[PDB]
Amino acid sequence: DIQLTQSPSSLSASVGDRVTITCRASQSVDYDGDSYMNWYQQKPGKAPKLLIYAASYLESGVPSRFSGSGSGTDFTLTISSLQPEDFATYYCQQSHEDPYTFGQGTKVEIKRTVAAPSVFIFPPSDEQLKSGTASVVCLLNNFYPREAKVQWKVDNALQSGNSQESVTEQDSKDSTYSLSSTLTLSKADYEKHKVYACEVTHQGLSSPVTKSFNRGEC
């Protein structure tokens, strides 16, 4: 079949900057003057969206900052000026021969200004406790860049191995990330201590921020 390769696989760029993505096809997709390469945009949780078809024609309804060029085996998608809404994975697709094939995808992220996270901590609910398990949750909200560090402490003992964390995709509203960390303990273990703390490290923090609660008192 025809294999398509995009480059880069990943990029990050300042708002407003010109962004170009390349697609190379293993064989020519040209047919009688036309070049059958297509581009899609796929945002988190949504279907891919057709931007460009036949290599250069802008699909109805798509903003004019998107343009396509190329011919034969080499094609380029250009965003003249990257807007916050344009966070997505971009795919090329050849329509010259079946099986119709897609590139491996290019992730485009917006590089915004540094923003510190807002930090929140949540005790487990009483409702959950009766099931025999306790989940403690730490929220890091609306920050940039994506790199952040969460440390769990239980009566000042550093917790390792009993947490998992998750990060949202970049929010197009403001180009920030949010992060969730969950500490899981048995009910018996949870009831054996008093002080639960979440210590957060991040570039926009001049020193680490800590949010905590007492399981007893409040």
Binding site: Y31, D34, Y36, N38, A47, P48, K49, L50, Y53, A54, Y57, E59, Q93, S95, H96, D98, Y100, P124, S125, E127, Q128, S131, S135
Partner: peptide, 28 residues
């Protein structure tokens, strides 16, 4: 323009192949 580009898509549905059984969530 060669037909085999896709302007209109459904929302997508997930297919999971597993031996495990279904399990509903607890919400807290």
């Amino acid at each position: 323009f060669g037909h085999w580009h896709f302007a209109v898509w459904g929302q997508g549905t997930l297919v999971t192949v597993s031996s495990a059984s279904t399990k509903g969530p607890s919400v807290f």
